[PDB]
Amino acid sequence: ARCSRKALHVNFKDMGWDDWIIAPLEYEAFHCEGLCEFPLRSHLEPTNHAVIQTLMNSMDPESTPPTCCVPTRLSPISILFIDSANNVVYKQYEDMVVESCGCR
Amino acid sequence: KARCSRKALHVNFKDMGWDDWIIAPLEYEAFHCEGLCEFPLRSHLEPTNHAVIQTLMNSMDPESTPPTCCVPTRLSPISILFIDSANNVVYKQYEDMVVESCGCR
Amino acid sequence: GCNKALCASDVSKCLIQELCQCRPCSCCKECMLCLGALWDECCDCVGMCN
Amino acid sequence: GCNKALCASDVSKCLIQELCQCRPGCSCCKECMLCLGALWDECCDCVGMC
Ligand SMILES: [Ca+2]
Ligand SMILES: [Ca+2]
Ligand SMILES: [Ca+2]
């Protein structure tokens, strides 16, 4: 129920990227979703600002909104594609897969 | 409903019950991040490649993929004078206390 | 304007390639190359219309 | 076991002080109790230290 990492399958043809991405045709990127209420676990590695906001949100939710569950660590994947200049490129793209989620 | 942006957030320590161990300051501006994170994501803020892709999927079928979220991407510190658990008086700089910029993630 | 249904896929293509991320200008021309025919209909999505 | 209304203020006090952030798999198990004081009994479950 609380902030956690969930599955997210990325299919490039579904996004209309099959015309420039050669391989892979799909990959798991995951996504972060869940509640961010007191207590924020340290598995959320929260900022001191996030800790305070969560407290204020718990005291008066009408006045202060809660923090949000977002990715805190991301890993890369390699992609073979055709750039705008029709060159074939095998590049490692950063921040493509979610490894851990946290409230911020 | 405006897009992701930095908004005001006044922190009053006595209101939070921290006046019994924080000497000064008793209040400060911390700001907060809130707003819509839909395509297009402000490209000058350099959002992560994952946020870019998720935003695209959310634009393709928002019913199936949820959007990214507006959170702080750069925080600055403030100094605080308090009494620690050992009754020692300490003047320390606390990190990640004030929001300087917001972004969709 | 920025046609989200027409520009979502191709504009995102240029972002993950680390293009169209400067502000007016240096990358204004490599960005135009990436959008191609959609430059007219999608330049506003990245504010590169000049 | 965690009274959120009773423990929100003091538990958060010890977190921003970088206490109660270790795992019992223990170092900070004792410094955390010192920070909570009388509320250790009523708030230990909020950090899984009991
Ligand atoms: Ca296409
Ligand atoms: Ca108190
Ligand atoms: Ca055209």
Residue numbers in the entry:
A (entry chain B): 398 to 501
B (entry chain A): 397 to 501
C (entry chain D): 25 to 48, 53 to 78
D (entry chain C): 25 to 49, 53 to 77
From the manuscript:
Twisted gastrulation (TWSG1) is an evolutionarily conserved secreted glycoprotein which controls signaling by Bone Morphogenetic Proteins (BMPs). TWSG1 binds BMPs and their antagonist Chordin to control BMP signaling during embryonic development, kidney regeneration and cancer. TWSG1 is composed of two distinct, disulfide-rich domains. The TWSG1 N-terminal domain occupies the BMP type 1 receptor binding site on BMPs, whereas the C-terminal domain binds to a Chordin family member.
Serendipitously, the TWSG1–GDF5 complex crystallized in the presence of CaCl2, and we identified a calcium-binding site that mediated TWSG1–GDF5 interactions at the periphery of the binding interface. Unexpectedly, the structure of the TWSG1–GDF5 complex reveals a previously unknown calcium-binding site at the edge of TWSG1–GDF5 interface. We confirmed the identity of the calcium ions by anomalous difference Fourier analysis. The calcium ion is coordinated by 8 oxygen atoms with an average distance of 2.55 Å: carboxyl group of GDF5 Asp416, main-chain carbonyl oxygen of GDF5 Gly413 and 5 water molecules. 2 out of 5 water molecules bridge the calcium ion to the carboxyl group of TWSG1 Asp34. The calcium-binding site is stabilized by a hydrogen bond between TWSG1 Ser33 and GDF5 Trp414, and other interactions (salt bridge between TWSG1 Asp34 and Lys37; T-shaped π-π stacking of Trp414 and Trp417 of GDF5). The mutation of the calcium-binding residue Asp34 to Ala in TWSG1 did not abolish the TWSG1–BMP interactions, indicating a minor regulatory role for calcium. Since the calcium-binding residues in BMP ligands are conserved, and calcium is ubiquitously present in the extracellular space, our TWSG1–GDF5 structure brings this ion into focus.
